[PDB]
Amino acid sequence: HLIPPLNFSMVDNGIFRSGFPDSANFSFLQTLGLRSIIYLCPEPYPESNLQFLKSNGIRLFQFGIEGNKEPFVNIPDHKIRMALKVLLDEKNHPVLIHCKRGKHRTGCLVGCLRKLQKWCLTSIFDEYQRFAAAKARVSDQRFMEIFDVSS
C-alpha cells in the first residue's frame, strides 16, 4: 500500500502539493516522476528523507520562510516569489511543493499560482481553505488579495 505524504494533493497539471513528506511516503512519492522538490522551511532536510532526495535525480529548492502563528504573522513576498519563479519553470516539473503542514506557506505559492492563472479570489481562497482544515489563516489570503503581477 502506498501512502501519499500529509495533506497530499495535485495542484495543476504537472504540480503536486503536500504538508511534509516522510519515509512512509517514499514509495508513493517515488512514482510521481519527481524531478525536484520545493521545500518551504528554514530547517535542514531530515537525513532519512534527504537520502531519498538526492539518489533520485531530485533537485531541492529550499526557500526558507519563517513560520509564525496567526496572532501575528508575516509572509515573505520575496521568498515566495523565488519559489513561484522555479515552480513556473516547466523544466522543473514534476515537482512537489511542501513545508510543514502544507496549509499556509504552501498555501500562498499555490494560491498565487492560481491568481496568475486568473482564478477568482473567491474560488481561489476556497481551495486555500479546503486544505487548512483545522487552522486556516486570513492574513495569508489577504496577502493574496493583493498579490501584484509583473509580466
Q: Residue ranges for the binding site for 1D-myo-inositol hexakisphosphate?
A: 74-75, 78-79
Residue 69 binds a copy of itself (CB under 8 A): no
> Closest CB to a copy of itself among 3 and 41?
3
> Closest CB to a copy of itself among 63 and 128?
128
CA neighbours closer than 13 Å in the CB half-sphere of residue 115: 20
Cβ 110 to a copy of itself, closest distance in Å?
Answer: 12
Residue 118 binds a copy of itself (CB under 8 A): yes
DSSP string, 45-93: PPHHHHHHHHTTT-EEEE-------TTS----HHHHHHHHHHHT-GGG-
Binder of a copy of itself out of 50, 60, 116, 120 (CB under 8 A): 120
112 a catalytic residue: no
**Cα–Cα distance for residue pair 138/107, rounded to 1 Å:** 11
* Omega cis (within 30) before 94: yes
Active-site residue (options: 99, 108, 112, 120): 99
Binding-site residue set: 74-75, 78-79
Give CA 145 to chain center in angstroms. 18
Residue 119 binds a copy of itself (CB under 8 A): yes
Active site positions, annotated? 99
